[PDB]
Amino acid sequence: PRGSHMEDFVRQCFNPMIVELAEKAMKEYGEDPKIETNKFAATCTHLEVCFMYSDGGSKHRFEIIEGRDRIMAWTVVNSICNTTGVEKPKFLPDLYDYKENRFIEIGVTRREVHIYYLEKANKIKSEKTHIHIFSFTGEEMATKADYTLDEESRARIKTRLFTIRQEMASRSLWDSFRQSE
Amino acid sequence: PRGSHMEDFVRQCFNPMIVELAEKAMKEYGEDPKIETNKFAATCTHLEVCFMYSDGGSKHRFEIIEGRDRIMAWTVVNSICNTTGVEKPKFLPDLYDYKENRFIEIGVTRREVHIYYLEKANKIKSEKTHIHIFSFTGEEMATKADYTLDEESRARIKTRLFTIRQEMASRSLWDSFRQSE
């Protein structure tokens, strides 16, 4: 344990509440944020994107599933299913859209949004669950070209993603981060 | 007094301000939250629903009548009546709709929304007061099919209701809660 300068960057780069939430998620899965630090930065990035995503749109539009502990998120998923009638997904998604009546799986990738979306779409058999991918280069890929949010909201997410990339490269940790996924 | 694990659940499940407001309501009616704990959970659930309800819509759209002490709520009801011209209801309602110019009676039930609405509609002789029922299973029933709020707002209330049900069943207190109303 200890020694990784990715850890000090992650702590100085991200909101402290997001960092505590990423630590719980990895510790729930038997991973050490001080050891697997590239996944520590990835879990923080994925968490923040999900939060800025639900921040886009109306006030009660989304239900945040990511960031809850495994049991609570599954409890909320059931309540959404058993009241809207939508089918229970096989894997925990990140958001639910009360406006569009679908769960959203949000992906952040260090490669082509084409490959990651292929990978994630091959995982969920429920083609009903919406998929929305973002990349650190500025691209995005969504189901049926339905990007759910306003252009301005998704622009904010892509900008924040590129800033995190620049700050990693400035600290010479980006190359290890990209060649880690 | 003391001993009920419904009490510890109610305290861990609901917002602490809602719990203090439910305690005042029952104590105003000569009921002990530590003894009649199923009504303690019911008064909390009814309180929260009324609060998420007024949270739906515009900022000045509703006037919260529930949660006030008996004298203050009746004082506010008079002021609404003596300025809008609407008729003074026989029983204290939960909300007033400045947008639709009617008081709202909000009901949460552990049975069919059909029976509860029948019961509540038979209580208020003023057919002018709007009735909106929710259930722990996900159904809702409103006057003239006028559901007052957006689909997304009512979806949030139904989801929260089903989560409270799951958490009660997980603690094996749901069966006593349903067969108590």
Add this chain to the structure above:
Amino acid sequence: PRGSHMEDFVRQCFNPMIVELAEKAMKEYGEDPKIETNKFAATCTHLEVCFMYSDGGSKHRFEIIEGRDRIMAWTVVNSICNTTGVEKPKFLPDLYDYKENRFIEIGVTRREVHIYYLEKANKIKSEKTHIHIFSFTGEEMATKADYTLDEESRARIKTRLFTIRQEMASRSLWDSFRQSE
């Protein structure tokens, strides 16, 4: 000094910030809130109405002139005039409407809105300044029937006014308050 139970009511009835602002206004005009307590309650009521009024509408829609000290309010009035081109009013108004490009004089009365509006309209030679009157009975009177705000926003002001009236009558201070203006 001391002894008036209107003073304890005013302090328990109104927001503490509004009470401090009313005290400064009267003390600026050589009046004692502990002695002239009916005007103390009136200045609080007028202050709150002006605040709920600017709270109606959009975020940057109004400029609050009431509640500022005499020099600062006149400084803001000049800045509004010397940038919008509107004529400098002879008497300090309460609000300025950036949406309608006019100053608003807000009146709260214990008699007919017809008489008070006549009185206030006879004071301002600038017929450009908008006048909006409210009463403790629920009536309102505005210039050119232009009520500036939504129906729901003005309904909130009339309700709050009637609650203050009920609370005064319950404390038997209303009759002295009405027969004091």
Add this chain to the structure above:
Amino acid sequence: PRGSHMEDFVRQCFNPMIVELAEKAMKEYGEDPKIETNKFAATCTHLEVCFMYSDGGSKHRFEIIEGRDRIMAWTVVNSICNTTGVEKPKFLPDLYDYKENRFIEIGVTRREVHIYYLEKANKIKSEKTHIHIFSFTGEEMATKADYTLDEESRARIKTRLFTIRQEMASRSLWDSFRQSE
């Protein structure tokens, strides 16, 4: 160092966070707020205008570039460029408009908005960057007559500017401030 009453005015006139941000900006450029106090008041005024500007419009509409340190602002500019495709400006702007897809250069002047806009438009070779000028007299000048914001929002900025002018003249520091730019 010390002695300037422009400094005490700037501290009493502006928000303390804006004052700390102006001090960092000048100290980054080798200027002393206690010595060059007219620029200290100017940097505060420019900062506040940029902040009320981004406050106009929608919640995620703008990206604040002014107020960041030189490296961070340039990092954010790159992220905006490398994700929107817009060209990297030669000089750091103040805002980016996600709604209009352009950087905004905001100018505050003590002379004609005609001269200052001429000066600033001659500096940026990128005619793509939008320019919006304000003056202490109440005028404004924008690119292609596209004023970006609502009439009410820009009216607030012009009023605040004229209040700062009045407060300087009342302290007899305005004449030195105008004949300093």
Add this chain to the structure above:
Amino acid sequence: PRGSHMEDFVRQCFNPMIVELAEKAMKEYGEDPKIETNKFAATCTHLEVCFMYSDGGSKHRFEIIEGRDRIMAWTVVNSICNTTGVEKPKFLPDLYDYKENRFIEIGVTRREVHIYYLEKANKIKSEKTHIHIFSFTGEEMATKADYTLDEESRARIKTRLFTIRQEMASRSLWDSFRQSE
């Protein structure tokens, strides 16, 4: 209900947390603070004195028994008894002195401290429980002349008591308050 100007004084005179605690105490005993207002002022006064009392002395010196609900205070009393060995009192006291190893019964009276102490000492058969009386005139009477606290601390309590008396007399509610105990 409603109408008593003792109620508005009690709310303006006492800390709002103390007022909420007095309301719970009376409502636990089937008393209405809006009806029995002299006892409402008395319960507030007794509560504050107990709080300034525990505020005297060292940080962990006292255990506050007053202000807790009946079940919780009795739970704490047992824990003090079953760990210190002191005898369980027949009636709930107000404080426990970890420094002197005794429960303290704190009395506030509107008559002679001689009579009230006689009354309270005749109620507790446990002569082990310390008694400390205060009056609105400035006198105090304690067991074995052991006044537990510093002279300066008890002086603060007597001063606060006399201020409450003056404020009641100024509002002409003192005579009803004294001839009510």
Add this chain to the structure above:
Amino acid sequence: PRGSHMEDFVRQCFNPMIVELAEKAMKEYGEDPKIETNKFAATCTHLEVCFMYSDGGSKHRFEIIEGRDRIMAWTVVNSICNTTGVEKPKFLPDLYDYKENRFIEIGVTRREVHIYYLEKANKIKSEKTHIHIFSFTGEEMATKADYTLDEESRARIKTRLFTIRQEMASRSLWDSFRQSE
């Protein structure tokens, strides 16, 4: 009104709560802080010294009389008198010492502490009231050479006084301040 740079200094120099308290004191006595600015700085300085004074010593040692409005301070003085037995002073003092059982009159002077103490001792016929003088040069003069407080506490007051003097001289307002008392 307006124009004095002593006003901007007073606002930037003193705690904002002390400034609000000084404004109320002068406005209670028919004085304008924007006009009589040397007294505005003096009332702030006297207020702060009284506050750092009560901050010296134990927690319940002093009762702050300065800073209260005239009626409330006299109410507290009576309560101190009618419970300690000390004689009611002819003029309102600043503090009461529960440890030494005497009221304290605190003076801040711009001349010799010898002259000011002579002046203040000639005003109070009650030789029982303790007098403690401070100067902007670093001297102090107290009754019976009883300086009430620790050496370190009074050293802090003298240092703060000399800093206020330096800041005034740096702004060239000290000479007017000294030749104003």
Add this chain to the structure above:
Amino acid sequence: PRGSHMEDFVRQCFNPMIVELAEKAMKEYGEDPKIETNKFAATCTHLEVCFMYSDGGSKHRFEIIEGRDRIMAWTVVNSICNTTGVEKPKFLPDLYDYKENRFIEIGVTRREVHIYYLEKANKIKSEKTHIHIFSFTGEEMATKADYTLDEESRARIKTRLFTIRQEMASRSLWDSFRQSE
């Protein structure tokens, strides 16, 4: 997972910060607070006692070792050792006493303090580390009869311990808690 009413009690009984710290400790050791709930209550109780313990005595007297993550606590232990000269303990203790120059191992037991102290003293070969045991019945056992703290401070810990016991028995979870250690 889920179902244990010990969990709802632990959450309603203990400070929320202590509950988060207990969850991290168990999750660091591969234990689930929702499954092993008796240890969840035990870790909370041990945590609180350590905190009230360091709260006793002077402000800088102790260094809290418990509650830190394993790496940070060991880092602090080294710093204490490499600056005071004390020997590095084989097992992580809970506190360090700057006043007595020794680490403290704090134990809370559901049996005789005699047995637990025997067990813990047999674990640490460093007889230099001080041991202080508390029980839920009110007993305590310390090294060389040196109880480190004042009588009043340890009395508070024993009382709090007995209250937790009563609240568990009232919820019928005490018998499982005692027969679990």
Add this chain to the structure above:
Amino acid sequence: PRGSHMEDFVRQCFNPMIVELAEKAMKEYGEDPKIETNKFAATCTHLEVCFMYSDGGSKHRFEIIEGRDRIMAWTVVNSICNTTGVEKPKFLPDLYDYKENRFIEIGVTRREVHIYYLEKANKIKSEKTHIHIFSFTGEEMATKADYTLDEESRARIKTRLFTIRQEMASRSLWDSFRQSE
């Protein structure tokens, strides 16, 4: 600029207020915290030690000179001198001891406390100014062996110093930090 992982450590290691104060100090002296990062960590360490130092002892015992801007610290030094009579030091010290009537120069070193004290004692011609040195290894050296503070307070400073050393070595930045002074 940018790239140093000492910067991310300094931000994650130290209190954010101390980091802002260190940045102002270096920027006042024409140094970049992002470039000269070893001095950035040193200025933070020196700042924290000075703060824990003044935290030792009584409440009004010290006057913090470090952390103020150059003009303000010199203003406070004059006020201390012109009221206590102590001689004005040639170089700005860190603290003033109201209890011992001397300025304190606090040094933190990465070598022998013997050499650094020799260096610092050779700089101040005023042998009246007290010198107190700390090292990252746990040693300390003070004037006349007068260590000013309690043993426990200085023990806390030495421990914190050794923790900062361990955290630097764990990040492999300690060797560059020690061989930089």
